[PDB]
């Protein structure tokens, strides 16, 4: 449905209790997926499944400030499957982003960028077909 890369505005920034849902299908032979929550040119939260990093599947999370990447947080639990449909949910909590894939908790990422109201765009990129991207308050 939707064109990738896709930019989803987050009007007024993120706030605790905001739930973002992304539905799509991983392409065959996919190499990478990325979600980038942006504060202007900075990336507050980069969520990056990698299908083949030295023959391993890994999720890399990080923050980019002033064009420099910080310390990576890596997760070896890998719920994505080439060719198959997925659901990503990102719930904004007071102290972290909480990510679930296919209704199962995956990881939390502590807020490094603390001006939550200034994180006002989400970029979706990589080797997917994107079906829907939306948000709501819970
Ligand atoms: O930090 C996140 C950034 O990472 C760099 S790569 C640096 C390597 O991760 C560094 N590194 C660390 C280790 C290591 C860790 C533990 C133990 C050990 F032994 C070794 N090995 N290598 C990427 O270019 C960068 N990016 C990805 C994309 C991007 C663009 C379109 C689609 C998409 F899907 C993605 N745009 N920009 C970002 O993802």
Annotated domain spans of the chain: 1-138
- How far does residue 69's CA lie from ligand 1's centre (Å)? 9
- Decide the pairing of beta strands 104-110 and 96-101: antiparallel
Sign of the dihedral through C-alpha 125, 130, 134, 138 = negative
Q: What is the CATH number of domain 1-138?
A: 2.60.120.200
Neighbours of 115 (CB within 10 A): 11
Q: Give the C-alpha separation, 59 to 98, whole Å.
A: 14
Smallest CA separation from ligand 1 atom 22, residue: 53
CB atoms within 10 A of CB 35: 24
Distance (Å, whole) CA 59 – CA 77: 8
Residues with CB under 6 A from ligand 1: 32-34, 46, 48, 60, 62, 69, 72, 74, 125-126
Report the distance separating Cα 92 and Cα 18, nearest Å: 5
Q: Which two tokens stand for residue 90?
A: 């990102």
Name the binding residues for a beta-D-galactoside: 69-75
CB 100 within 8 A of CB 108: no
Distance from Cα 118 to the centre of ligand 1, integer Å = 24
78 in helix, strand or coil? coil
Report whether 25 contacts 131 (CB < 8 A).
yes
Q: Quote the Cα angle for 53-97-32, to 5°.
A: 25
Rounded Cα distance between 5 and 133, Å, is: 12
Binding residue ranges = 69-75
Q: What resolution in Å is listed for this PDB structure?
A: 1.3
Query: Taking the alpha carbons of 25, 27, 31, 36 in that order, is the dihedral positive or negative?
Result: negative
């Amino acid at each position: 449905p939707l064109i990738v890369p896709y930019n989803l505005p987050l009007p007024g920034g993120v706030v605790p209790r905001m739930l973002i849902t992304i539905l799509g299908t991983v392409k065959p032979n996919a190499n990478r997926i990325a979600l980038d929550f942006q504060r202007g040119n900075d990336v507050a939260f980069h969520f990056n499944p990698r299908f083949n990093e030295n023959n391993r599947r890994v999720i890399v999370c990080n923050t980019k400030l002033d064009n420099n990447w910080g310390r990576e947080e890596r997760q070896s639990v890998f719920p994505f499957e080439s060719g198959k449909p997925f659901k990503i949910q990102v719930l904004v909590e007071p102290d972290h982003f909480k990510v679930a894939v296919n209704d199962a908790h995956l990881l939390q990422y502590n807020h490094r960028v603390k001006k939550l109201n200034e994180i006002s765009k989400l970029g979706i990129s990589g080797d997917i077909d994107l079906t829907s991207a939306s948000y709501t308050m819970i």
